[PDB]
Amino acid sequence: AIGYVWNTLYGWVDTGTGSLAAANLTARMQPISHHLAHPDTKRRFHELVCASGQIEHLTPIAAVAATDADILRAHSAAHLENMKRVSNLPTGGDTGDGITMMGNGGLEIARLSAGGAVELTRRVATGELSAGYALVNPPGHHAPHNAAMGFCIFNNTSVAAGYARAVLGMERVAILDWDVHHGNGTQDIWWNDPSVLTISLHQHLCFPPDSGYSTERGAGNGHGYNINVPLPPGSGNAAYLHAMDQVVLPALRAYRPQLIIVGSGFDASMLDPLARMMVTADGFRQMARRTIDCAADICDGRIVFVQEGGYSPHYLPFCGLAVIEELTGVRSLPDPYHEFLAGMGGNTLLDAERAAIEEIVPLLADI
Ligand SMILES: O=C(CCCCCCC(=O)Nc1ccccc1)NO
Ligand SMILES: [K+]
Ligand SMILES: [K+]
Numbered sequence: 001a002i003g004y005v006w007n008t009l010y011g012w013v014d015t016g017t018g019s020l021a022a023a024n025l026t027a028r029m030q031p032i033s034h035h036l037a038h039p040d041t042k043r044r045f046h047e048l049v050c051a052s053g054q055i056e057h058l059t060p061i062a063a064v065a066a067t068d069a070d071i072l073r074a075h076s077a078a079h080l081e082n083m084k085r086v087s088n089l090p091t092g093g094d095t096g097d098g099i100t101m102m103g104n105g106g107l108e109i110a111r112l113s114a115g116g117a118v119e120l121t122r123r124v125a126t127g128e129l130s131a132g133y134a135l136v137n138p139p140g141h142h143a144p145h146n147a148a149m150g151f152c153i154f155n156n157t158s159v160a161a162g163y164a165r166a167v168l169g170m171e172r173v174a175i176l177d178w179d180v181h182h183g184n185g186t187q188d189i190w191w192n193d194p195s196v197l198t199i200s201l202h203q204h205l206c207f208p209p210d211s212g213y214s215t216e217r218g219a220g221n222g223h224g225y226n227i228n229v230p231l232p233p234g235s236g237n238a239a240y241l242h243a244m245d246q247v248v249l250p251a252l253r254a255y256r257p258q259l260i261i262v263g264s265g266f267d268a269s270m271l272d273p274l275a276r277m278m279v280t281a282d283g284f285r286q287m288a289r290r291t292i293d294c295a296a297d298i299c300d301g302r303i304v305f306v307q308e309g310g311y312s313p314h315y316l317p318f319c320g321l322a323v324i325e326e327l328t329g330v331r332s333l334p335d336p337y338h339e340f341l342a343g344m345g346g347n348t349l350l351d352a353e354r355a356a357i358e359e360i361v362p363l364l365a366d367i
């Protein structure tokens with residue numbers, strides 16, 4: 001029984017009229033209809049879930065607004081307070097990094113995004129659902145304990161993990177983040193804490209800058225329970241699956257989480273503007289399959305996917321659909337870009353990709 005979260009307001013996130021930063025006359029950055037992070041990309045994934053008939057194989061789960069209590073399990077009081085402040089401003093405004101915006105009352109959507117993750121998590125853990133996908137927006141993984149950052153207001157997976165820890169009494173939770181950018185926020189939150197294993201695969205130094213080196217391993221009792229797997233630009237299916245087989249899956253098995261939460265971004269895709277990676281819908285399909293099978297093995301199948309980044313409105317929907325299909329076990333639509341993208345490469349493990357991955361294998365010892 002597979003749960004699925006979509007809220008209409010996920011598609012109503014106001015990304016303004018700029019490209020990344022706001023439009024800017026002095027810099028001559030012309031206004032544009034669709035900001036890189038415009039909600040249409042994720043809405044098209046939702047609509048494809050419905051139009052493809054996958055929705056008939058899913059159990060719709062209503063998002064519930066994350067409470068202050070919920071948020072403070074992952075975030076500082078100062079941060080919550082600050083988000084309330086910014087959300088209450090007449091126009092809303094900058095959440096702190098000059099780029100991540102929230103409109104007036106935008107906290108509502110932020111709360112629904114984190115709360116979608118929490119609700120799906122709650123229902124998978126009760127045993128009502130076997131697994132699910134929370135197609136939330138805004139994303140979460142850059143938001144650290146005490147800030148918003150990189151389109152992220154709250155760290156959705158960390159709020160969910162926190163809930164699983166405090167409310168559901170789970171001793172260990174794993175967050176596996178395959179969004180192409182470093183999950184610095186998640187890393188920060190659980191830095192000193194061995195009870196949440198935080199793994200990030202990412203294009204090395206893609207975003208944030210100066211972040212996501214494999215030397216970043218946690219501290220105190222949490223040392224050895226943060227694993228960064230920085231990969232070179234041009235990495236594709238072969239590199240991603242090698243990282244899964246050599247680091248990710250071994251790591252999950254060593255750690256023995258009671259729940260696996262996947263920060264599922266699709267910005268590693270072949271056609272994404274915001275990274276240089278070569279993962280195809282079939283690549284994501286194999287990644288999802290391995291992780292679900294792993295959960296079946298080690299934590300009674302308890303696996304919760306939570307949407308992170310991805311910026312191709314054309315291609316993201318098919319990458320997302322492939323993951324949904326691995327959840328439902330109904331595989332009823334081709335990737336219509338498959339042959340076009342297959343010819344481009346990425347499906348051979350290059351020596352430099354193998355070496356980047358090899359660099360992390362020794363860290364498994366400390367789990
Ligand atoms: O998919 C994503 C988004 C990655 C890119 C976000 C960039 C936001 C940004 O431009 N931040 C910034 C850059 C320079 C100075 C200050 C803020 N998250 O994983
Ligand atoms: K940790
Ligand atoms: K990542």
Ligand SMILES: [Zn+2]
Pocket residue numbers: 179180181265267308309310
């Ligand atoms: Zn990303």
